[PDB]
Enzyme design. Structure first.
Site, PDB file in Angstrom:
ATOM      1  CB  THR A 144      -0.952   0.044   1.221  1.00  0.00           C
ATOM      2  OG1 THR A 144      -0.209  -0.087   2.434  1.00  0.00           O
ATOM      3  CG2 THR A 144      -1.966  -1.084   1.138  1.00  0.00           C
ATOM      4  CD  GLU A 149      -3.372   1.499   4.159  1.00  0.00           C
ATOM      5  OE1 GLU A 149      -2.382   1.719   4.888  1.00  0.00           O
ATOM      6  OE2 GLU A 149      -4.002   0.413   4.184  1.00  0.00           O
TER       7      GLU A 149
HETATM    8  N1  LIG Z   1       0.692  -2.309  -6.427  1.00  0.00           N
HETATM    9  C1  LIG Z   1       1.220  -1.484  -5.504  1.00  0.00           C
HETATM   10  N2  LIG Z   1       0.388  -0.661  -4.782  1.00  0.00           N
HETATM   11  C2  LIG Z   1       0.862   0.198  -3.821  1.00  0.00           C
HETATM   12  N3  LIG Z   1       2.197   0.260  -3.526  1.00  0.00           N
HETATM   13  C3  LIG Z   1       3.065  -0.549  -4.224  1.00  0.00           C
HETATM   14  C4  LIG Z   1       2.596  -1.433  -5.209  1.00  0.00           C
HETATM   15  N4  LIG Z   1       3.700  -2.056  -5.688  1.00  0.00           N
HETATM   16  C5  LIG Z   1       4.726  -1.637  -5.071  1.00  0.00           C
HETATM   17  N5  LIG Z   1       4.424  -0.722  -4.172  1.00  0.00           N
HETATM   18  C6  LIG Z   1       5.374  -0.041  -3.274  1.00  0.00           C
HETATM   19  O1  LIG Z   1       5.132  -0.593  -1.992  1.00  0.00           O
HETATM   20  C7  LIG Z   1       5.333   0.449  -0.999  1.00  0.00           C
HETATM   21  C8  LIG Z   1       4.644   0.122   0.305  1.00  0.00           C
HETATM   22  O2  LIG Z   1       5.235  -1.030   0.873  1.00  0.00           O
HETATM   23  P1  LIG Z   1       5.047  -1.264   2.426  1.00  0.00           P
HETATM   24  O3  LIG Z   1       5.614  -2.599   2.782  1.00  0.00           O
HETATM   25  O4  LIG Z   1       3.582  -1.275   2.718  1.00  0.00           O
HETATM   26  O5  LIG Z   1       5.947  -0.134   3.185  1.00  0.00           O
HETATM   27  P2  LIG Z   1       5.097   1.077   3.858  1.00  0.00           P
HETATM   28  O6  LIG Z   1       4.706   0.580   5.323  1.00  0.00           O
HETATM   29  O7  LIG Z   1       5.977   2.286   3.933  1.00  0.00           O
HETATM   30  O8  LIG Z   1       3.861   1.479   3.132  1.00  0.00           O
HETATM   31  C9  LIG Z   1       4.758   1.671  -1.685  1.00  0.00           C
HETATM   32  O9  LIG Z   1       5.187   2.908  -1.057  1.00  0.00           O
HETATM   33  C10 LIG Z   1       5.198   1.488  -3.128  1.00  0.00           C
HETATM   34  O10 LIG Z   1       6.453   2.201  -3.280  1.00  0.00           O
HETATM   35 ZN   LIG Z   2       1.827   0.772   3.101  1.00  0.00          ZN
END
Ligand SMILES: Nc1ncnc2c1ncn2[C@@H]1O[C@H](COP(=O)(O)OP(=O)(O)O)[C@@H](O)[C@H]1O
Ligand SMILES: [Zn+2]
EC number: 2.7.1.26
Length: 154
Positions: free
Chosen positions: A37, A88
Site C-alpha cells: 500500500t 493508503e
Molecule cells: N501495487 C502497488 N500498490 C501500492 N504500492 C506498491 C505497489 N507495488 C509496489 N508498491 C510499493 O510498496 C510500498 C509500500 O510497501 P510497504 O511494505 O507497505 O511499506 P510502507 O509501510 O511504507 O507502506 C509503496 O510505497 C510502493 O512504493
Molecule cells: Zn503501506
C-alpha cells in the site's frame, strides 16, 4: 458481502480527484502481506477527506505514467490523538519497483465499506482480496471504466 457496490453510474461526490507524493507508511509494511500500500503525503488529504467516511474506497490511480484500478483505505494517523487523515492506495495487479517520492494522481469513484473490527491476519487478507474483486466488478461498468482515460491522467 456483496461482490459489487455503488450505483450503475458514477454519482456525487464521486469522482474525487486529487494528487500527492507517495511517502513511507507507519511501519508494518503490507508488502509482507502480499498487498503493498502506498501512503499519500498528509498535506494532500487533510481537508479533502476530513469529512469523508473512514473505510475502503475504489477508483483509478496513476503513478510513473501508468494507470491502474485501485482500492484505497482512509483512516487516521495511528501516532497522534488529534484526527489526522491518512490514505493508503493499493494499485491492483501492478508489476514494478517501488515508487516512493513519485506523485500519484487519484480518482476515487466509490465507497466499498467501513473499517472492519480486526479479526486476524487471515481475515484481513480475505477482506482485502474481496475489496479488490469488488473494485474490479464495480469498475467494469461503462460509467466507471471511462475514467481510466480521464483527462486528469493526461
Ligand atoms: N501495487 C502497488 N500498490 C501500492 N504500492 C506498491 C505497489 N507495488 C509496489 N508498491 C510499493 O510498496 C510500498 C509500500 O510497501 P510497504 O511494505 O507497505 O511499506 P510502507 O509501510 O511504507 O507502506 C509503496 O510505497 C510502493 O512504493
Ligand atoms: Zn503501506
Amino acid at each position: 458481502r456483496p461482490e459489487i457496490v455503488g450505483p450503475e453510474k458514477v454519482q456525487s461526490p464521486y469522482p474525487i480527484r486529487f494528487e500527492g507524493k507517495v511517502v513511507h507508511g507507519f511501519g508494518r509494511g503490507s508488502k509482507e502481506l502480499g498487498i503493498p500500500t502506498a501512503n499519500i503525503s498528509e498535506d494532500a488529504i487533510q481537508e479533502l477527506l476530513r469529512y469523508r467516511d473512514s473505510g475502503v474506497y475504489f477508483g483509478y490511480a496513476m503513478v510513473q505514467k501508468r494507470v491502474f484500478p485501485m482500492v484505497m483505505s482512509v483512516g487516521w494517523n495511528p501516532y497522534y490523538k488529534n484526527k489526522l487523515r491518512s490514505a493508503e492506495v493499493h494499485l491492483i495487479e501492478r508489476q514494478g519497483e517501488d515508487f516512493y517520492e513519485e506523485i500519484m494522481r487519484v480518482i476515487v469513484l466509490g465507497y466499498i465499506r467501513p473499517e472492519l473490527n480486526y479479526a486476524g491476519l487471515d481475515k484481513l487478507i480475505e477482506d482485502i482480496h474481496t475489496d479488490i474483486r469488488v473494485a474490479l466488478n464495480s469498475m467494469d461498468r461503462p460509467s466507471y471504466s471511462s475514467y481510466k482515460k480521464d483527462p486528469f491522467f493526461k
